[PDB]
Copies of this chain bind each other. A is one copy, B any other.
Amino acid sequence: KQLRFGLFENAQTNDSGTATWRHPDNQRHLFDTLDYWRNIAQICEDAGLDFVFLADAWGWADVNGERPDICDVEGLDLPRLDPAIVAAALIASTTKLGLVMTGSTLLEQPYSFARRMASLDHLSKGRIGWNVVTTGTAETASAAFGVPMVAHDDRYDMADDFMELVYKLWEGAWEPDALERDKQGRYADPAKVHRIDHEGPYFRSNGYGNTSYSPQGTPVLFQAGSSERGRQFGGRHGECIFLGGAPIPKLAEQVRAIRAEAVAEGRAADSIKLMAAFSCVIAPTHEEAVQKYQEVLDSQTPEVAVASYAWFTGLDLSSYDPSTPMSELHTELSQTQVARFAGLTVGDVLADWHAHGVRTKPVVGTPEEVADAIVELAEGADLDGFLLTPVIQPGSTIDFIEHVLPILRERGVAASGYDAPTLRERLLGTETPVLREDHPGAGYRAQ
C-alpha cells in the first residue's frame, strides 16, 4: 500500500493555536511575501509531495468579548492572507504539485465560489483541491460579515445545501465536451450548456454557470471536521478526510467509523481516503531530537493558552474552577476541541494547551524511528496518507523530505515521483480525473 503525503500550511505566521514564531529558524513571519510560498512549493514539488494544503480561518481570538493584547504580541491569530490568492499565485510557480485550499460553506457565496474554484482548476490543469469546512471561528466571523450566527449542526445542513448547488454548477451546468472552439464551425454546442435551478433551505440559484467544465469537474474534496455531524458530512461528500492525530487504537476506530459511514452512504469503503495529521522532530540521535523539541517548546509562551482556546471554542477556560469537567461544556464552534478532552478537567486542558493547540503531539526521534512510526500508524489505523504538520518552517518540512521520506520510499510505502497529472488521479487512484459514479456530485451530471 502506497501512502500519500501532503504538507499542512496556512497563510499566517503561526498555526493551530500555537505560537512558535520566535524560534530562531522559523521563517513563517514572512508568510505575507510571495518568496516564502515559492520556496515552500519548490521544496515540496522537488520532493514529489502530492500537495500543499492551506488551512483557513475567518474569525479571531475573542475572549469574553475582547481580543487580549497577547494575541498581537505573539501574532497568535492574525493577520492572515486569503488561501485562494496564495493558491493561484502558486499555480504559476509549479507544474505538478497539488494545491488544496480551505474554503468555508458558512461564509462563501456558492455561485462566486464555484467560479473561483473552477478558475483555479482550469488554470492549474486539474491540480486543485478544496478542504470543505463549516468554519471553527464562526461567532466572530459572523460578526465580521454582519450576518446572524448559525449553530454547529445547522452549518453542516447548510453545507449539504452548499454542496448540492456547487455540484450543479460544476457537473450539471456545462457538459465535459461542450466547448468545441472550431473557428470553421461552433465555439460551443448549445445542447450541452444548461440552465440550472436550485431552491434549497439556504441557497437559491437560477441560470447558467460562469465556468465551463474544468479538468477535474469538481476539485478534490477534502473534508476536515471530525465531530459526529462532521463525520456524517465527510462520509457523504469527502474524498480525502483529514484527521487529527490520536493513539493508534483511537485512530483505528475513527477510520473504521468513517469508512462505515461511507458504506452507509452507498460508497465503496476504500473509495474514501483517510489522512492523518503528523508532526515530527527529527535529529541524528534520539537524544538530539528530544533536545530539539525542547528548544521548540522553549520558544512558546504559555500565556497564549486562554485566547488560543477561546479562538476555536468561544470558551474562556480562565473563568471556571479548574476541576470543572469538559464533559459539562458545549460549543457551537469547533466541537472536536471540546469532545477530545472528555474525562479531563478545565485545569487539565489549560495545563499544556499552549504546547500543541488543536494539533497533535509530535513523533520525536531519529529518521529511522520516525519512518517506523509512520508505517506503524498507517498499518495500525488503516490510513491512506499523512499531512505533515510542521512545528517550524521551512525546517520541519525540509527535515522530513531529506531524512524520513527516503526511508519510506525505500520501503515502498511512498511513491518516488509524480505519476498522474491531476490531483484526483493521484490521490484516489482513478484513471479518470473526475468524481466516481458513487459520489453524490456525479448524480448532477447531464444524462
Contacts of A23 in B (CB 8 A): 183
Can you name 25 A-B residue pairings with CB atoms under 8 Å? Answer: A32-B122, A33-B122, A34-B92, A34-B123, A38-B92, A71-B190, A72-B187, A72-B193, A73-B186, A78-B208, A78-B210, A78-B212, A79-B209, A81-B122, A81-B211, A84-B84, A85-B123, A86-B123, A89-B91, A92-B93, A109-B145, A111-B145, A140-B208, A143-B206, A144-B210
Contact B85 A120 (CB under 8 A): yes
Partner among B115, B145, B174, B204 whose Cβ is within 8 Å of the Cβ of A205: B145
Any B CB within 8 A of the CB of A60:
yes
Is A203 an interface position by the 8 A CB rule?
Answer: yes
A107 smallest CB distance to B (angstroms)? 7
Looking across the interface, which residue of chain B has its beta carbon closest to that of A212? B79
Contacts of A417 in B (CB 8 A): none
Complex Cα distance, B397 from A392, in Å, reads: 46
Residues of the B chain whose Cβ atoms lie less than 8 Å from the Cβ of A102: none
Which B residues are in CB contact (< 8 Å) with A193?
Answer: 67, 72, 78
The reply to whether A72 and B115 contact each other, CB–CB distance below 8 Å, is no
Within the complex, what minimum Cβ distance (angstroms) separates A114 from chain B?
10
CA A190 to CA B71, docked complex, whole Å: 8
Q: Knowing A72-B187, A112-B107 are in contact, say whether A85-B84 is a contact too (CB < 8 A).
A: yes
Chain B, residue nearest A23 (CB) = B183
Inter-chain contact A207/B144, CB cutoff 8 Å: yes
Contacts of A146 in B (CB 8 A): 111, 198, 203-206
A409 contacts chain B at the CB level, 8 A cutoff = no
Give A189 to B190 CA distance when docked, in angstroms: 58
- Which A residues, 58 to 88, have Cβ-Cβ distances below 8 Å to chain B? 58-60, 62, 66-67, 69, 71-75, 78-82, 84-86, 88
Kindly state whether residue A439 has any CB partner on chain B within 8 Å.
Answer: no
Contact A69 B190 (CB under 8 A): yes
The distance in angstroms between the C-alpha atoms of A144 and B29, with both chains bound, is 40
Does residue A195 face the partner (Cβ distance < 8 Å to B)? yes
When the two chains form their complex, are residues A208 and B32 in contact, meaning their CB atoms are under 8 A apart?
A: no
**A residues lining the B interface (CB < 8 Å):** 11, 13, 21-24, 29, 32-34, 38, 58-60, 62, 66-67, 69, 71-75, 78-82, 84-86, 88-93, 107-109, 111-112, 115-116, 119-120, 122-124, 140, 143-146, 174, 178-179, 181, 183-184, 186-190, 193, 195, 198, 203-212
Closest to A75 in B: B187
> Is B203 a contact partner of A116 (Cβ separation < 8 A)?
no
With beta carbons under 8 angstroms apart, the residue of B33, B123, B195 that contacts A32 is B123
A92 is contacted by which of B32, B90, B109, B208 (Cβ under 8 Å)?
B90
**How many whole Å from A106's CB to the nearest CB in chain B?**
11
Q: Please indicate the chain B residues that have their CB under 8 angstroms from the CB of A206 in the complex.
A: 143-144, 146
Closest residue on chain B to residue A196 by CB atoms: B144
